[PDB]
């Protein structure tokens, strides 16, 4: 005349998940395993950040007038903007991506004098395309002209030996004029040739005058070359003309990480995954925001949602 028995709980509305041999099974809970939300700011607290403005990353080695405050910087995070430029006189670098990748993780630079001295020539060439309070040039290079118009140019040689414990970075430049008369007016008449020598490096360069399209009101060009020096070696420059002499050498310090972005900076935050739109802060193992994120980030998938079951099957009454 008595009866006792058992059952399980149920809910009115469940959630649909996917199993091995079915699609759309209803359960009580499920959770999400894919991240789709971000913070539209560069969150950085506890680290030193440097926000380059109009200054390009490669300009800090040469020093155009727009990079006067980043000549010797220290940072743990480096941010580059879209409007940055690293030239005041028309020209470009050679093999620039490798240099950018090297400098992105450097964590800063330190400058040291070289000690070169010159006699019998003029070393104060100035142009109107780089203006500080008049006509000026790059802050860390010298433009060696002739004594007077249509004069000669003696053949010269210079040398520098590394002393410190770490490898050094050396940068020089070559000038291509906009005519065959300018090469004569400035550097004199005749052939011109420069040569750069080291233990693991021996190259020669020769200018090529010609007419080109006008950029910033100029027709000439400047080409920048670079090399790395082991901490016992010596570098020799032999030249007769068309030389942009260096003045200082750079040494790296520490390590850091660099990104490219277009949003502002927040100093009250914490994050480790950055992309060009903000920060990704989550504990889920997958993300569906950007495929080129850098740092400590989750994995990128093409799916938009993937639900993971948490309760039993849902069997509602009647």
């Amino acid at each position: 005349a008595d009866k006792i028995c058992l059952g399980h709980h149920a809910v009115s509305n469940g959630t649909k998940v996917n199993t091995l041999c079915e699609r759309g099974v209803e359960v009580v809970n499920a959770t999400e395993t894919v991240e789709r939300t971000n913070i539209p700011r560069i969150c950085s607290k506890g680290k030193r950040t440097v926000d380059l403005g109009q200054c390009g990353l490669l300009g800090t080695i040469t020093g155009p007038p727009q990079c006067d405050q980043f000549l010797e910087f220290s940072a743990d995070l480096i941010i580059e903007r879209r409007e940055g430029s690293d030239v005041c006189y028309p020209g470009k670098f050679v093999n620039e991506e490798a240099l950018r990748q090297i400098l992105r993780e450097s964590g800063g630079i330190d400058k040291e004098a070289m000690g070169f001295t010159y006699s019998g020539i003029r070393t104060n060439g100035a142009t109107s395309s780089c203006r500080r309070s008049g006509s000026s040039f790059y802050a860390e290079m010298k433009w060696l002209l002739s004594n007077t118009d249509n004069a000669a140019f003696p053949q010269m040689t210079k040398s520098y030996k590394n002393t410190r414990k770490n490898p050094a970075l050396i940068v020089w430049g070559i000038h291509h004029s906009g005519s065959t008369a300018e090469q004569t007016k400035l550097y004199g008449s005749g052939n011109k040739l420069v040569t750069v020598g080291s233990s693991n490096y021996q190259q020669s360069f020769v200018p090529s005058p010609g007419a080109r399209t006008q950029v910033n009101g100029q027709s000439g060009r400047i080409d920048f070359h670079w090399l790395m020096l082991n901490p016992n070696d010596t570098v020799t420059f032999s030249f007769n003309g068309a030389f942009i002499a260096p003045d200082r050498a750079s040494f790296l310090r520490g390590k850091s990480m660099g990104i490219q972005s277009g949003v502002q900076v927040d100093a009250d935050c914490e994050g480790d995954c950055y992309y060009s739109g903000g920060t990704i802060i989550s504990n889920l193992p997958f993300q569906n925001i950007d495929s080129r994120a850098v740092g400590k980030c989750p994995r990128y998938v093409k799916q938009r949602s993937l639900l993971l079951a948490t309760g039993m099957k849902n069997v509602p009454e009647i």
């Binding site: 006792i4 058992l6 991506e97 080129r292 993971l308």
Partner: protein, 172 residues
Amino acid sequence: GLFGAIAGFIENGWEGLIDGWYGFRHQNAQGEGTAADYKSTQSAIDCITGKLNRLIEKTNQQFELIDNEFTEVEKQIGNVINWTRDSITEVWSYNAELLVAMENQHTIDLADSEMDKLYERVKRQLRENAEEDGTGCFEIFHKCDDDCMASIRNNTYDHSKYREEAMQNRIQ
């Protein structure tokens, strides 16, 4: 499930059960009553949370940039970079889908197994004193008050006390 208890010989669940996943329901001369079971709920919740924690684990590795989005790179190397990235993405998507499907398949079977184990444990206690009707629960052949139900619930039921009366009722 593949144990045939949930959505098997038990028709539907109860929406009035709010303090557990499994429970009892008794009726006798005094009235009706409901309760809940503590061991099975904890057993399921334990590695439901275990699976969640195992999935949440975070592995450290740092990646950097290899291309530029302001000034483009040489075509022949950018093509290779894009090819490699597209190759990796498919592998990761396939892995995610397979893992989610497998875990979803396992959980339901675990819950069904727990329900079946509880039912069998309760059945084994009332030897030769109760009968099965097939809808999923028992009928008693003697007089059982609230104390007897409470004893059944917490595994303190002695079948030697009512054996003779139950046998006489069942035989004739």
